[PDB]
Write a protein that binds this DNA or RNA. Structure first.
Ligand SMILES: [K+]
Ligand SMILES: [K+]
Ligand SMILES: [K+]
Ligand SMILES: [K+]
Ligand SMILES: [K+]
Ligand SMILES: [K+]
Ligand SMILES: [Mg+2]
Ligand SMILES: [Mg+2]
Ligand SMILES: [Mg+2]
Ligand SMILES: [Mg+2]
Ligand SMILES: [Mg+2]
Ligand SMILES: [Mg+2]
Ligand SMILES: [Mg+2]
Ligand SMILES: [Mg+2]
Ligand SMILES: [Mg+2]
Ligand SMILES: [Mg+2]
Ligand SMILES: [Mg+2]
Ligand SMILES: [Mg+2]
Ligand SMILES: [Mg+2]
Ligand SMILES: [Mg+2]
Lengths: 230, 146, 260, 186
RNA sequence: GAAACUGCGAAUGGCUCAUUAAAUCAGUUAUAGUUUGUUUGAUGGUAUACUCGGAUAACCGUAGUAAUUCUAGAGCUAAUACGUGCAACAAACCCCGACUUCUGGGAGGGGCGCAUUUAUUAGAUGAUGAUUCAUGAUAACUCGACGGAUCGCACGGCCGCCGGCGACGCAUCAUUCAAAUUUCUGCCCUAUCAACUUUCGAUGGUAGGAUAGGGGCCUACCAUGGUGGUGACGGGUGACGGAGAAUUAGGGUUCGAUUCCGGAGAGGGAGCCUGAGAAACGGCUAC
């Protein structure tokens, strides 16, 4: 049985193939989100602790959390949920697909595993490097949290810190910087002010029409009283 | 006397337990019996204004409105609770022979307690909302056979 | 059907559009708007079939997307916008203004109006009743809601609306003796004065109208539109002056024109 | 599913009507709420035609009740269902439906009566207004004898399966006498 | 600017005529018995702010499976996605009510946006042929998906504050686009079809439930009704209805699957999700 081991801290992924029956047994009968101790499933894995995050069977059917068995079942699934991506399918469409239970059994092709606690040794290609984050924060508050700014601190200066610089195929220099979202600009303040002024003018127009109608009705009643005075 | 059901029977939106009762107020106010003119030149029978019956399907004291067709006819059956069969008699022209044939239509109509009717009376019914599976009309005026 | 229809078959189009039978499988289905679909003249028809400014559907789109056409003072870019009776169609580039009136044959005719006369429309009051907050409000047959109307204005009245200011500047009470134009039925486009109003409880109300030359016709209340206080209409009328002609007199006119 | 169509019925002549169309969604019915009197309040959102909302009460224990002669409305706990005119099954199951007769807590109405009239069933202005109100004050002694037990007979006027609420009025007068006779005959 | 998220559409159109004989459908009504994305018009006040939070796609790279817009795990990052949250301020009105000198005054406290539900009350002698109508007031009620944390262009006026033209979005009413239900009258042959319907809804009544809304539509109880030689009920149709078509001195006879209107179906049944709108089938679930 293959193990697709991922190290979320360094962002490295590596597939490990374990065929010995004992090491496989130290994972059998376990469920998704349950954690395993690496010392059980080999020599190189001492200290390491692995979290079972799912897997696929010999027919490529994913394991689902909460099914509570080792076999295959058919479930009516919703789009965007695990075991049913539903790409190109209509909104509100359900489908009955074959999913495997959350319990690890001998009928699994692969176990998706995650490293939660780093062991005493180092795994080649897994914990011996660090793949950097592809993109930096884009929302202003996230930028402030990242660089520990406070109120009245400008976030743009720090956007220039993690610009991606590369050469075009022609050979010219190109720099990429994200557009900051949720950033307060004078246009935003003007928009809020215009909203407030719209409320102002709504109220003023309402009062004006109400007062004019009241004056017209009062004049009409006075004219009726003039008729009565005949 | 009118409380013949397993439930109290009241005119909707009329407060009977009012403390400031008064008789000079309009119908439905101060605990007064509610009644209405159906319109279309039809007088409200005095036994509906002075009645004690509670009929939600009454045209004069109930909640139904008269709108649509106004059909005359003869009482053909009066053996149901507040519902009678109105038979309409008419001549159907036959084009090829240039003659007529007699044809009839049986129209179920709800009759309120303000009218007492017998088979053979000339009745005037007005169209209302569906009151049951087959009833879409309310008796508005009853003319005895004699 | 499981929902609204999006297409108008050309045969099923209103006959006053004068669409030809072999021009295609379809007619422009009027969009929802101020006027009913069966009683309007869509903008695409006005621009292409009537004014000849555009020659195709796509050319109508090109003209309208340039923001060249205002309906009752407001720019419309929808080609199937349901322009209707008394609407002002203005093109503030060629400096031309049009009032959508009916000719005596029941067909909408673009009537040229002055710049000052294009500053108001005539609307027919549909109902007067209390809105929220107890505020009185008026609504018309061309889809407008006007709050705080004059209390002397009742249903079936004609109000004069200034398009620039969006207020009732004057109104006409629906009375016997007021000049009217028929907007529906076989007498569409006929202009006369009301002689009497025959009311019948529970059914439609009949209006008796007599035109200037003395011909008498009758039509329902929902098809009568007051256009002036007395015998003088508030708007200008097309060449026919609302006086319907019998086919014999039309042939007389054609013979006289050919002879000249 | 549950339908509301006249298709499946016999004709008024008794003749059977052959079906000419499958069931449409615009003529559906849904299963009854069967609102129970219980202190485990559950009201569910029912998405209905037009994208509108219907509130489906499953369990209710509190309602908004009006004392019409006093023109006062108070939120009171529902204690028991005592009379139903359509089915005593709904009485034993404690089902809350429109026009059901229920026991409601009289404590809020006692409190309001004490505050407003000064009568249990500190200023010159307050005492003057209280004496003005107490002049002409008349209770009906039936509402009083049930106030003695702290339970008022009430009629559910709202539809719990539609609006998610169990609202009503306090029974008075001839309706009160009618329903007391029914409950004593039970 | 690809991709992708978000939004909208895919309920139209096209095809067919199997079922269906007062049923569809036609003309003619009605909604005072309802829903209605959108358009058009009007309306919107009492609930860190110089602007909140956590995810996720595309991307990237570990995969599984014989395989499918079959599918799992890891690393990132957006919003008009999702979720929260100040919501520019106000009068009026209602209730309680310390004190006051008092048939009152009155501090203070509570309620009060819009929507929802119930109840009381006004609506006279604003509206309709007609409404306990529109609508107002009051008491409460609801664990309210409401009351803008959005975007473009221009960017000026006063000394930081104000500021235009738009776009998108929320809610209410009206309008428009419509549907649903519904009134009356009208259909071929057959009596070698004369009685039919009603346990288990048949006809009506009461109270509910359900529905967008009327209604035996369904439930409980009650009554015994309802249709029928003016042909009920049943059977036949190589029967979808109509506009129409052929032939016609007149009268008539026969046809009307097919391009316009209406209906119905997507192998046969049934059931649904999404959605304003489908019992959808170039959507799903089952037999
Ligand atoms: K339909
Ligand atoms: K859609
Ligand atoms: K019809
Ligand atoms: K209903
Ligand atoms: K019933
Ligand atoms: K939609
Ligand atoms: Mg932004
Ligand atoms: Mg279609
Ligand atoms: Mg009202
Ligand atoms: Mg009922
Ligand atoms: Mg057939
Ligand atoms: Mg045909
Ligand atoms: Mg065939
Ligand atoms: Mg064909
Ligand atoms: Mg067709
Ligand atoms: Mg279909
Ligand atoms: Mg086939
Ligand atoms: Mg289907
Ligand atoms: Mg196909
Ligand atoms: Mg299709």
């Amino acid at each position: 049985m293959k193990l697709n081991i991922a190290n979320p801290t360094t962002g490295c992924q590596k597939k490990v193939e374990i065929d010995d029956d004992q090491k496989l047994r130290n994972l059998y009968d376990k469920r998704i989100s349950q954690e395993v101790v690496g010392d059980l499933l080999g020599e190189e894995f001492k200290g390491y602790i692995f979290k079972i995050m799912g897997g696929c069977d010999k027919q490529g059917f994913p394991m689902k959390q909460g099914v509570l068995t080792s076999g295959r079942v058919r479930l009516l699934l919703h789009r965007g949920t695990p075991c049913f991506r539903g790409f190109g399918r209509r909104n509100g469409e359900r489908r009955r697909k074959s999913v495997r239970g959350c319990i690890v059994s001998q009928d699994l092709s692969v176990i998706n595993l995650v490293i939660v606690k780093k062991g005493e040794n180092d795994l080649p290609g897994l914990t011996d490097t660090e793949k950097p984050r592809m993109r930096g924060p884009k929302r202003a508050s996230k930028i402030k949290k990242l660089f520990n700014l406070g109120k009245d601190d400008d976030v743009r200066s720090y956007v220039n810190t993690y610009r991606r610089t590369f050469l075009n195929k022609k050979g010219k220099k190109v720099s990429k910087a994200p557009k900051i979202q949720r950033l307060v600009t004078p246009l935003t303040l003007q928009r809020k002010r215009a909203r407030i002024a719209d409320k102002k003018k709504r109220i003023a127009k309402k009062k004006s029409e109400a007062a004019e109608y009241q004056k017209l009705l009062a004049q009409r009643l006075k004219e009726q009283r003039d008729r009565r005075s005949e | 006397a009118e409380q013949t059901e397993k439930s109290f029977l009241k005119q909707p939106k009329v407060f009977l337990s009012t403390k400031k009762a008064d008789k000079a107020k309009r119908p439905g106010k101060a605990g007064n019996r509610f009644w209405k003119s159906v319109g279309l030149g039809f007088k409200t029978p005095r036994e509906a204004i002075d009645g004690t019956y509670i009929d939600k399907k009454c045209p004069f004291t109930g909640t139904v409105a008269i709108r649509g067709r106004i059909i005359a006819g003869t009482c053909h059956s009066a053996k149901m609770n507040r519902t009678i069969i109105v038979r309409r008699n008419y001549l159907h022209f036959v084009k090829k022979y240039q003659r007529y044939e007699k044809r009839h239509s049986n129209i179920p109509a709800h009759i309120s307690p303000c009218f007492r009717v017998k088979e053979g009376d000339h009745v005037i019914i007005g169209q209302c909302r569906p009151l049951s599976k087959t009833v879409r009309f309310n008796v508005l005026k009853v003319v005895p056979a004699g | 059907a499981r929902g609204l229809k999006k297409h108008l078959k050309r045969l099923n189009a209103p006959s006053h559009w004068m669409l030809d039978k072999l021009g295609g499988a379809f007619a422009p289905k009027p969009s929802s708007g101020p006027h009913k679909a069966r009683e309007c003249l869509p903008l695409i028809l006005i621009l292409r079939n009537r004014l000849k400014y555009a020659l195709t559907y796509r050319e109508v789109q090109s003209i309208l997307m340039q923001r060249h056409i205002m309906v009752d003072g407001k720019v419309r870019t929808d080609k199937t916008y349901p322009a209707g009776f008394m609407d002002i169609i203005s093109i503030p580039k060629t400096g031309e203004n049009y009032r959508l009136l009916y000719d005596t044959k029941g067909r909408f005719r673009l009537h040229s109006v002055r710049d000052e006369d294009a500053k108001f429309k005539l609307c027919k009051v549909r109902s007067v009743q209390f809105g929220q907050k107890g505020i009185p409000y008026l609504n018309t047959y061309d889809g407008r809601t006007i709050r705080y109307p004059d209390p002397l204005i009742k249903a079936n009245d004609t109000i004069k609306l200034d398009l620039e200011t969006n207020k009732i500047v004057d109104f006409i009470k629906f009375d016997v003796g007021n000049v009217v134009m028929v907007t529906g039925g076989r007498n569409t486009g006929r202009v006369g004065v009301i002689k009497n109003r025959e009311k019948h409880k529970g059914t439609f109300e009949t209006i008796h109208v007599e035109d200037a030359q003395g011909h008498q016709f009758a039509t329902r209340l929902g098809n009568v539109f007051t256009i002036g206080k007395g015998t003088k209409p508030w708007v200008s009328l097309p060449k026919g002056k609302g006086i319907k002609l019998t086919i014999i007199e039309e042939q007389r006119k054609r013979d006289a024109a050919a002879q000249a | 599913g549950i339908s509301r169509d006249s298709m499946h019925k016999r004709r008024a002549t008794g003749g059977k009507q052959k079906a000419w169309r499958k069931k449409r969604k615009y003529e559906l019915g849904r299963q009854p709420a069967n609102t129970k009197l219980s202190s485990n309040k559950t009201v569910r959102r029912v998405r209905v035609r037009g994208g509108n909302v219907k509130w489906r009460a499953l369990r209710l224990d509190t309602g908004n009740f009006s004392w019409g002669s006093e023109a006062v409305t108070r939120k009171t706990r529902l204690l028991d269902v005592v009379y139903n005119s359509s089915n005593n099954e709904l009485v034993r199951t404690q089902t809350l439906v429109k026009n059901a007769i229920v026991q409601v807590d009289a404590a809020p109405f006692k409190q309001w009566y004490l505050t407003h009239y000064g009568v249990e069933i500190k200023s010159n202005n307050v005492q003057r207004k209280l004496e003005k109100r107490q002049q002409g004050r008349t209770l009906d002694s039936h509402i009083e004898e049930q106030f003695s037990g702290g339970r008022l007979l009430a009629c559910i006027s709202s539809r719990p399966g539609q609006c998610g609420r169990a609202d009503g009025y306090i029974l008075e007068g001839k309706e009160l006498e009618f329903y007391m006779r029914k409950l004593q005959k039970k």
